[PDB]
Ligand binder design. Sequence first.
Ligand SMILES: *[C@@H]1O[C@H](CO)[C@@H](O[C@@H]2O[C@H](CO)[C@@H](O[C@@H]3O[C@H](CO[C@H]4O[C@H](CO)[C@@H](O)[C@H](O)[C@@H]4O)[C@@H](O)[C@H](O[C@H]4O[C@H](CO)[C@@H](O)[C@H](O)[C@@H]4O)[C@@H]3O)[C@H](O)[C@H]2NC(C)=O)[C@H](O)[C@H]1NC(C)=O
Ligand SMILES: *[C@@H]1O[C@H](CO)[C@@H](O[C@@H]2O[C@H](CO)[C@@H](O[C@@H]3O[C@H](CO[C@H]4O[C@H](CO)[C@@H](O)[C@H](O)[C@@H]4O)[C@@H](O)[C@H](O[C@H]4O[C@H](CO)[C@@H](O)[C@H](O)[C@@H]4O)[C@@H]3O)[C@H](O)[C@H]2NC(C)=O)[C@H](O)[C@H]1NC(C)=O
Ligand code: NA
Ligand code: NA
Ligand code: NA
Lengths: 674, 667
Amino acid sequence: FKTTPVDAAFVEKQKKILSLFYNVNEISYEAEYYKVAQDFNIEASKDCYTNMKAYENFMMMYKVGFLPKNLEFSIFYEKMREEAIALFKLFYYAKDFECFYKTACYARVYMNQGMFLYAYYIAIIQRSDTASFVLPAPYEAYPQYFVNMEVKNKMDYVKMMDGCLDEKICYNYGIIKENEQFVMYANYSNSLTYPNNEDRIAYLTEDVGLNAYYYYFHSHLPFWWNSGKYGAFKERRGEIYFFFYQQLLARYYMERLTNGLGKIPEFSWYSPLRTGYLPPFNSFYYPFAQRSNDYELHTEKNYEEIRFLDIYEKTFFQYLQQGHFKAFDKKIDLHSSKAVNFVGNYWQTNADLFEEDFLQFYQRSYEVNARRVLGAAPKPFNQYTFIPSALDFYQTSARDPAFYQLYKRIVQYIIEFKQYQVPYTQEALHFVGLKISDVKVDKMVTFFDHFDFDAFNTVYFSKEELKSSPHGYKVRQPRLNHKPFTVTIDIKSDVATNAVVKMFLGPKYDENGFPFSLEDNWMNFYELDWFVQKVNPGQSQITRSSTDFAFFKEDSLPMAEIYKLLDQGKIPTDMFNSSDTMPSRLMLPKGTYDGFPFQLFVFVYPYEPTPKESEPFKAVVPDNKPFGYPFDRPVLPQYFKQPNMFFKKVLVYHEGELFPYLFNIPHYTPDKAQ
Amino acid sequence: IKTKNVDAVFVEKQKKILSFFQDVSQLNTDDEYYKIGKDYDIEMNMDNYTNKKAVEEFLKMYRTGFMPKNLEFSVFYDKMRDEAIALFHLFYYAKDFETFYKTACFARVHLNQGQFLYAFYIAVIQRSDCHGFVVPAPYEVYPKMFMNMEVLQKIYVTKMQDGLINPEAAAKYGIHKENDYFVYKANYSNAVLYNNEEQRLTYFTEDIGMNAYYYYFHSHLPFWWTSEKYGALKERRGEVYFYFYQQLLARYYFERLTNGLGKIPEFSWYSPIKTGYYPLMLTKFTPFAQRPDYYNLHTEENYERVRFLDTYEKTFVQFLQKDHFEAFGQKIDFHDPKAINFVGNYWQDNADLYGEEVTKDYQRSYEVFARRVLGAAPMPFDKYTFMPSAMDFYQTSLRDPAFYQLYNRIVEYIVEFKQYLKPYTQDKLYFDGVKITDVKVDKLTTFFENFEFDASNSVYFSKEEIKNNHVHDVKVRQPRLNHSPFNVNIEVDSNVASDAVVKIFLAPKYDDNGIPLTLEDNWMKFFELDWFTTKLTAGQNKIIRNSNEFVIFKEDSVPMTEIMKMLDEGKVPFDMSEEFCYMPKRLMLPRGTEGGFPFQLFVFVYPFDNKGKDLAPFESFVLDNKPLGFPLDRPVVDALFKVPNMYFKDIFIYHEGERFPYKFNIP
Ligand SMILES: *[C@@H]1O[C@H](CO)[C@@H](O[C@@H]2O[C@H](CO)[C@@H](O[C@@H]3O[C@H](CO[C@H]4O[C@H](CO)[C@@H](O)[C@H](O)[C@@H]4O)[C@@H](O)[C@H](O[C@H]4O[C@H](CO)[C@@H](O)[C@H](O)[C@@H]4O)[C@@H]3O)[C@H](O)[C@H]2NC(C)=O)[C@H](O)[C@H]1NC(C)=O
Ligand SMILES: *[C@@H]1O[C@H](CO)[C@@H](O[C@@H]2O[C@H](CO)[C@@H](O[C@@H]3O[C@H](CO[C@H]4O[C@H](CO)[C@@H](O)[C@H](O)[C@@H]4O)[C@@H](O)[C@H](O[C@H]4O[C@H](CO)[C@@H](O)[C@H](O)[C@@H]4O)[C@@H]3O)[C@H](O)[C@H]2NC(C)=O)[C@H](O)[C@H]1NC(C)=O
Ligand code: NA
Ligand code: NA
Ligand code: NA
């Protein structure tokens, strides 16, 4: 519930930014943004931009025309990408906030909804003056991607009937009036959307924050954008790539573990993919593409793409087999520091992997092609109209099990390369004159909580209604969550030093009930937190609350609540400092009444600062150390018995109901955690 | 246009009927049906039903619980089906109109609307007091199943917005307000998706008439109900089955030809199936299931289903291996053409296959499970919760290439039986001293024309809007195929005054390589257009027959509002009152080409049983007991067949105007 103060100039500018997220699916002919848009003469505005070549480029594509309103926009299709990147460059190179805003009002009014939102979200995140301003949560901007079609439909019907037929009847269908607004209860999906064991974890993969999280990841550093803005970070880009996915997959594999699901399965482009998924969405023209269980990847429609994909991976194998090779106009050694970066950019086909300021249409991307084949859609009708899968959007990608299958496949390939890195030696890890004597944690408890957000942006309003910037329509759904807990660390030091304290969470046992060995477990640990303590000689005890963990955040406030906070000169400080991290809700994987066993790994090493990175991301240790150190590479497990290391077995309990559905039953009062 | 007159008593009853097809998704609590419905007690009225056993069974089943109001009813699933059938029994065994009506009022009020409408539509058709009555075309009753989701969504958008926000902008999307209707132009699925060559045929396979047609076919004669009611017809049931598909399939094949698409594809349950279907339709819960190209039928989920299906076929193969056998308590001999009955009933697995009034769950349907596996949906969640596919409904079945591929398979097996039958001989077919000396046909020309249908039943209204009888009416318009009327002039030399039957068939000229088509192996590609009778005088005669008079087809259904107007004028539509279960007239010809696609017409004149008396159409067919499709109901031998009372005219189907339906829908 934490805030940050803000003056009137901010408030007024902020409000201007947010005003464009109102009733995104329509136009209020009475809005201020509409007057600005009408007043804006795009052909006479060359002087609004600091880059005339970008403006000229836009005006050219614009003279021929863009993606029409009402078609689905996706970053994964070439022409739409060029157009969206072009729009973004105008947003970005606008000289001023006033020029930025006029341009944004223009695009808001005259361009495809999805395109505009896409570029506007990114621009705000990216523009120097505009960063430090808050954005509505991805699910409040794009409800259509965060709301399964049962509810979305009920919403259509409720709006068409301007309320309920008879209030008791739609109490039974989970629809409520609460404070002049509607609330629809929403369950997670059937086996008619997840038609296999994967359904056990719908509550994770359909989770709105998880999905938001991935969308924020993309938006902070789009594959198509070079690193110029982040200077010295350019060097660490590929390294992020690995860390982001490795880390995400670890979090995901933990959920599997507590639902008895075991290892994410391998697959092949020459065989059928066992595990299907039926996205519960529809676009303007099309229901989303369904991928049934045992879907044949290898058919006529996909042959040429499979040829592409196969060689793409096999050339990585050739790079591993040589060790030094000239590739992409560089001479690159895989014992080199620069290697980690290369690898990452190679798999993502970055703008950085090439010359490029902005990615050339013609540089074929393994991720792009992978998502087309796994999405299982029919081939696009023309280049403005394609049949959407979940893999077509960062908002929806984490929903399809095939997503984790793809990125696990990538991560394994990079781990294959990671054999070329030099495993940390003993004195390397050994912190001289520093020992952790004990670690102690509070009770770790997961549980479920209803959570609300306003889905009004996917609901339609009348000419009259739009004047009021109407937003009646809320989705209440049980989401994972845990109680706050503290870790206390007992330390003995010879000397006063400065130390970094990192603590990770990972698995304890196989699916066979065997202890994981570190040589096989290191990729399965995810970072919870890091910080810097001045450490005194003698015995000390460091306490750390789950509330202060570096890698997690509070939920976003609805746009309504943001405005209510501006009215009293404030902003939600997590939405401010760190919108791009995992929600704290999802910090722990769902536990059991037993207590599910995991290891908390605590690690203390010497703090040796470097000049602050200017960061596209999660502020990471002001260190020359890698991301996710010391788990950034294969280990020699002997070297992990150091006195400044501590593995502590920890059990995650659960409380109240065991399944989200038990919360959305009309007339049943659930067991709520206390 | 073609009407009929009706007393004020019929009028009150007809309007009572139609009130159940008016706002189907919602309940008007002020309305008369609701007051009646809510408190009506079936138990207290037990003695007002012919069949106590039926009503008891209903009350039992109903107190147990029916399907819920929000789900999607399909007849192809056991429990839902049984509920439906029980409800139907209730409607059917009602003593009189009044009780039937009170029974509907109840069901509308208390039950799933899909279930109710399925039940009611059939009851209206099947009740004897209700013969002469009229049901609205299925596309008005279930409009959501006769349009792609693009359009449906546009409808919902416009309603949420309480109108058009920027008329000019909306016009770009084929939406405009016209008086007090909102009008949506609707494109066929291939305007937005061409996944395989089958999309070439969408204007046929999606045509709201063709689909409605199949829906009527089922409603008139459901697989689960006995043909008892129809007396003598019962012994012909199988015959009607084969005929219906063999005809439909022939008509379909014609469409195939004129789009350069050839013979209907064969599949194997042990193999993937090459032809996918991507339904662009949905339900309040879920989208219809998609079948990708090269969808593998043989996966874990289907292993048992395939076993059953494979066996069902192998079983018939065994029947073919004996010629005479005992099955289902009958003794069958395949040399006997009347065995067609058994054969048709075997494949449909209908009530008349056993001696029963309704089918039972343990009497497992080949067609049900074929549909289920071809449909590619994942396994249903529970009994009321499944992912619909186009083959879960008769309204939608024609939309899927797989439908034709299935019934093709079945029909073929049935002709494997037809090979047992002795070919009609020279002297069975001769009409002594009569000769068709010439056939001349007018211009055969197809075209498209915009058609509108009232799609209002798809719109949800407000408490306040319902009592205000506020109007938000919705029309969907799309180009539908039609053709110009034409005459067939037949010149015949009768030696002597005789009464004759004339029959007219349409057939292909060549296959898709230009091999001319021989009766020996193409007899089942003959599509019957007309059956009529004529006095034939001595010397030279000439019959002139107009395509409007062709007996096998019907005019378009009139909309409910138009029917509603006619009732105030003691009028009712003729075609809808009697002739509803026939193919719509506009579709009789396949889409021709601008330069004249070649078919041929087969005219056949044969001796009619005098009657010694004057003649009326319906019983005139039953007086001569020629098998359906005579003389092309069994294999022909060309040389043994041709005769002077036969004639084959090469003909050409032209198309005029705009060739592609999307060009009508252009902004
Ligand atoms: C049924 O299905 C059909 C076929 O898919 C649809 O027909 C398409 O309709 C769309 C309009 O919705 C057409 O696209 C638009 O039409 C114009 C095309 O002009 C032609 O001729 C000019 C020369 O005058 C050529 O330059 C050009 O190559 C075209 O061949 C354009 O005027 C439109 O531009 C407008 O919108 C764009 C964005 O789309 C803006 O950037 C512009 O400022 C301008 O406002 C647009 O390109 C399309 O041509 C039709 N397809 C075909 C094959 O004819 C129907 O819409 C559909 N019906 C329904 C109810 O859905
Ligand atoms: C999220 O998903 C969950 C899990 O599926 C849904 O929970 C189901 O919700 C429905 C309510 O929508 C429940 O159905 C109801 O069951 C009640 C309990 O009944 C017991 O006792 C009755 C006799 O009273 C027995 O017949 C029965 O066997 C049980 O022993 C009933 O009291 C309810 O009565 C209703 O019945 C008829 C419909 O047949 C109505 O017309 C009546 O008016 C009356 O409302 C009702 O049938 C079901 O139990 C829940 N499932 C589970 C597994 O717990 C949530 O609804 C869903 N939430 C959302 C928002 O989708
Ligand atoms: Na596509
Ligand atoms: Na997976
Ligand atoms: Na077939």
